[PDB]
């Protein structure tokens, strides 16, 4: 229970009050682009 999404995901840089959960600690989440609505996610 409480998980965290997995590293070389997909992330959303639109989810208002971060209702998606986010990657666990160690990850970040960028956009593709300004101008988009999607991104991913790494271990930083």
């Given at each position: 229970?409480?998980?965290?999404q997995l590293?070389?995901?997909n992330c959303?840089?639109?989810?208002?009050?971060?209702?998606?959960?986010?990657?666990?600690?160690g990850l970040?989440?960028?956009?593709?682009?300004?101008?988009?609505?999607?991104?991913?996610?790494?271990?930083?």
């Amino acid at each position: 229970y409480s998980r965290c999404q997995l590293q070389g995901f997909n992330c959303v840089v639109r989810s208002y009050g971060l209702p998606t959960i986010p990657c666990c600690r160690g990850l970040t989440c960028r956009s593709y682009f300004p101008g988009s609505t999607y991104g991913r996610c790494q271990r930083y």
